[PDB]
């Protein structure tokens, strides 16, 4: 990720490797993703692997693989919490813009 900050999600080689990932491998990847998202900091890496899987698999097949309902019920509300925190961050980026507009109001 530190590399690929510079619909491509990674190096395209790594992307294709994830798209050729297997079923038991997928369950393991979702499980360790679940942990990484449970922490409130590594959720960026958690989200990158989730979105890469989502963009490169068949959703019906994913759902029909067993256990994914357990791991998805584990995943979802932590991501909603992250979402509302990001909302607060944007709303404070606007105090930064206000300082701009008042400074040029003064000038």
């Amino acid at each position: 990720l530190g590399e690929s900050r510079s619909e491509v999600i990674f190096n395209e080689e790594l992307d294709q490797a994830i798209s050729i990932l297997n079923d038991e491998q997928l369950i393991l990847l979702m499980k360790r993703c679940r942990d990484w998202n449970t922490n409130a900091k590594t959720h960026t890496i958690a989200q990158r692997t989730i979105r890469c899987i989502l963009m490169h698999h068949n959703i019906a097949k994913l759902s029909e693989i067993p256990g994914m309902v357990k791991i998805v019920d584990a995943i979802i509300p932590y991501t909603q919490r992250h979402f509302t925190r990001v909302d607060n961050l944007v709303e404070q980026s606007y105090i930064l813009d206000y300082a701009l507009v008042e400074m040029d109001k003064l000038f």
Binding site: R5, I50, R51, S63, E64, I76, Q80, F83, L100, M103
Partner: protein, 842 residues
């Protein structure tokens, strides 16, 4: 009050360590225990021997086991002798100047392999821990360290400065590259451990545990798992034991040997390409007489290998090395378990070993004692009498430390010195009683069949007319000295067997120490059972009774001296010490000061009138078996299971402030480099990199980022409040430089956002009342970039939330066999939904 120190040492020819050979054969260097031995082969006399700086036995010397010379290595072109001690200390010596020049300290474990490019003074060492240390000699520190194996180091080869190949008992071979300073290759060598590593520039050999060697091909080929190292050769049965050490030489056909566990050295030879082509096509003839070609692929090992011969030595062997010449005679230096150097010969004409048994030449066994030493004695201020378990009796003169004469009896148990005629008398547990001379012929008399079990003790009156003997066939036999033969005075039985005996030095009483844990005491002229000593709780092992025959001291194997009085037979004082078990205790000839020796490599010197240990002695490391006190001057003699003899003669910035000054330096360098870039724009000097930046190896961005992450999450607000306005401006410029270096952003976006917003919201009024177009543009750029990054993360979050909600919805649609009865649906989903319990207070 007289202190004591050791003067010297005897008989340690070559300890459990390596052996090295200087060409003039040539002269030889081996290992004593905290001493290095160097002498000649032609003769057999100690040229020199080297120990540490400070003498042992003082309070200055540490009360500890001395770290034995586990390894030693010689460079004649530098004339240096690197020695290595078992707690892990590396020293270096010379032969002419014979001084210690520089002393390292890098190991916690016993030193195993010591190879140095003294050509470049790069010393590479490995001890019994796992880490291999590269030292630079002239810098007198370790250059660096490689720690990746897990058990210990036993195989080692360094080449150029480039390559390092290691084999370790955690049975794996690894290969480090030293320029990349880390590991490249790893393979599994043998079943359990792997020990022997030997290198020729393409062909490499390792021996493991199953009498089994593997031959390996070495390259510098590109591959990571392959390419470098492959696994060609498999050979079995040098001898059933495991393989321990390999060494490789030539003149020209090449030869190597492997020292096994037992008495056997298996030496092999590798032939050349002509015979390789001969053997290939001849085996191909046997083939025509590719299935059998992969059979050739099996037999490749013995196809190149060729066994030269075996060497079968005496009792055991411990170290071995080469002396080659002329392609006709190949001689070999060897040293054994017990103290023996053995120099061997193989004659040949490239074709045959020319003799089924090589010539076991040049044996050095004189000063060594060649077995486990069993007892000791003194002879009237001039001689010392060591008796060892081959019946090796050796007299020594104290002034010159050399030898006089030699006998043999086999496995003896007890010895004494008789001053009449300077006779020495011995007894063996194969129950026989022998006695021999010094100036007349060897054997004086052999009383065959003393008893029909083991005899155990033997002492003498001051008369010299009566000897006393104790034999574990429940018998104690007294002898008289007929004028020079012997007769049996008396034989007295008991119901338990004799463990030891003694008589009074002033010739009054007689003590017998017995397996029923007791000490009986009779008289010398009556045998009247005057005293009985009880209460040792183990079989009492040794006996002494002082110069006036007033004080008894008794030694039992439950680690306590017990001191007794001949007035009535009461224990004066007990004294627990000597953690393993006491072997032998002896008084001094003059007063109640004594010496105790025990099975834990200690000799303690005590006063009885004060009941204390005045001195504790830490000469050696093995069990102390024999102890002799001198008759008049009183020097101390000790013999120890490592076949060693010893002699002893008498004499703060706060959060906020740290952030501000670090930000100060970082902004200084960044603004300097931007002045540099605009000056290059005018050119169409680089400002010097600061010590802190170039030393911690950081961009200024990660440097300020480090100090922010270091400041903890409860002093942050006080810090950002206490910083003033100019440093606020420098902070904003720092943020804009991060927005240029985007990749440091996305790992610290929350920290950046929280700190930035708090700084501006607090310091708002001054900052908005200012006017600065660079500030306006800085705010504009950081606004745009923050919006891009935050909306990016928000895009990812909401995208994946929606996707997974759809996925879970699809599962519920496909597998949720619904109940149309809505009350049943309520009940089912509620009693099958997730429950979770908490403890409320009512």
């Amino acid at each position: 009050y007289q202190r004591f120190e050791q003067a010297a040492a005897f008989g340690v020819i070559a300890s459990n360590a390596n052996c090295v050979w200087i060409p003039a054969p040539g002269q030889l260097i081996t290992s004593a225990l905290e001493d290095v031995n160097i002498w000649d082969i032609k003769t057999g006399d100690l040229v020199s021997k080297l120990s540490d700086g400070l003498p042992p036995g003082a309070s200055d010397a540490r009360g500890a086991k001395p770290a034995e010379c586990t390894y030693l290595e010689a460079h004649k072109d530098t004339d240096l002798l690197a020695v290595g001690y078992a707690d892990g200390v590396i020293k270096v010596w010379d032969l002419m100047s014979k001084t210690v020049l520089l002393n390292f300290n890098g190991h916690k474990a016993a030193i195993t392999l010591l190879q140095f490019d003294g050509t470049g003074t790069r010393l590479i060492s490995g001890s019994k821990d796992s880490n291999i240390i590269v030292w630079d000699l002239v810098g007198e520190v370790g250059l660096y360290k490689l720690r990746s194996h897990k058990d210990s180091i036993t195989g080692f080869w360094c080449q150029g400065e480039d390559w390092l190949i290691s084999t370790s008992k955690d049975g794996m071979i690894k290969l480090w590259d030293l320029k990349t300073h880390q590991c490249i290759e790893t393979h599994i060598a043998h079943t359990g451990e792997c020990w022997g590593l030997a290198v020729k520039d393409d062909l490499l050999i390792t021996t493991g545990t199953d009498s089994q060697v593997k031959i390996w091909k070495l390259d510098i080929e590109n591959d990571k798992m392959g390419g470098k190292l492959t696994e060609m050769g498999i050979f079995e049965k040098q001898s059933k034991q495991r393989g321990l050490k390999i060494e490789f030489i030539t003149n020209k056909t090449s030869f190597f040997y492997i020292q096994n566990a037992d008495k056997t050295i298996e030496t092999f030879r590798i032939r050349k390409e002509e015979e390789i082509a001969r053997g290939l096509k001849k085996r191909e003839k046997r083939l025509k007489e590719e299935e059998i070609a992969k059979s050739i692929k099996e037999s490749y090992s013995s196809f190149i290998l060729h066994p030269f011969q075996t060497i079968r030595s005496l009792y055991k062997i411990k170290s071995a090395s080469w002396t080659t010449v002329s392609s006709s005679k190949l001689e070999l230096v060897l040293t054994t378990s017990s103290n023996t150097i053995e120099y061997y010969s193989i004659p040949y004409e490239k074709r045959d070993p020319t003799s089924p048994a090589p010539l076991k030449t040049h044996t050095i066994e004189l000063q060594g004692q060649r077995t486990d030493v069993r007892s000791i004695d003194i002879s009237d201020d001039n001689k010392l009498l060591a008796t060892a378990s081959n019946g090796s009796l050796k007299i020594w003169n104290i002034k010159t430390h050399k030898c006089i004469r030699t006998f043999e009896c086999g496995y003896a148990l007890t010895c004494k010195f008789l001053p009449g005629g300077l006779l020495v008398i011995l007894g063996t547990r194969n129950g026989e009683l022998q006695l021999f001379d010094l100036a007349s012929s060897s054997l004086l008399d052999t009383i065959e069949d003393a008893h029909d079990a083991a005899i155990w003790s033997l002492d003498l009156t001051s008369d010299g007319k009566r000897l006393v003997t104790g034999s574990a066939d429940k018998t104690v036999k007294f002898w008289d000295f007929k004028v020079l033969k012997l007769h049996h005075d008396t034989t007295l039985e008991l119901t338990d067997d004799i463990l030891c005996v003694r008589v009074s030095p002033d010739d009054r009483y007689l003590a017998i120490s017995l397996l029923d844990n007791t000490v009986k005491v009779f008289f010398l002229d009556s045998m009247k059972f005057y005293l009985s000593l009880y209460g040792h709780k183990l079989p009492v092992l040794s006996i002494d009774i002082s110069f006036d025959s007033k004080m008894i001291i008794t030694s039992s194997a439950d680690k306590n001296i017990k001191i007794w009085g001949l007035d009535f037979g009461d224990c004066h004082k007990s004294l627990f010490a000597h953690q393993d078990s006491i072997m032998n205790v002896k008084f001094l000839p003059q007063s109640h000061n004594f010496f105790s020796c025990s099975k834990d490599a200690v000799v303690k010197y005590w006063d009885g009138e004060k009941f204390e240990c005045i001195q504790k002695l830490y000469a050696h490391q093995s069990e102390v078996w024999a102890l002799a006190v001198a008759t008049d001057g009183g020097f101390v003699v000790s013999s120890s299971h490592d076949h060693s003899i010893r002699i002893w003669e008498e004499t703060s910035l706060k959060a906020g402030e740290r952030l501000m000054e670090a930000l100060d330096l970082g902004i200084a360098e960044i603004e300097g480099l931007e002045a540099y870039n605009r000056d290059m724009k005018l050119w169409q000097i680089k400002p010097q990199g600061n010590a802190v930046l170039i030393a911690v190896n950081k961009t200024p961005e990660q440097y300020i980022m480090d100090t922010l992450l270091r400041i903890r999450m409860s002093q942050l607000e006080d810090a950002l409040m206490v910083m003033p306005f100019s440093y606020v401006l420098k902070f904003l410029k720092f943020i804009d430089t991060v927005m240029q270096n985007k990749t440091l952003l996305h790992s610290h976006l929350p920290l950046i956002c929280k700190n930035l917003f708090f700084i501006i919201k607090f310091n708002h009024k001054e900052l908005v009342s200012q006017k600065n177009e660079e500030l306006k543009l800085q705010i504009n750029r950081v606004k745009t970039e923050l919006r891009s990054a935050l909306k990016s993360t928000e895009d990812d979050l909401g995208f994946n939330v929606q996707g997974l909600k759809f996925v879970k919805q699809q599962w519920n649609l496909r597998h949720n066999y619904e109940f149309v009865d809505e009350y049943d649906q309520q009940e089912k989903e509620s009693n099958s939904a997730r429950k979770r319990v908490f403890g409320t207070v009512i």
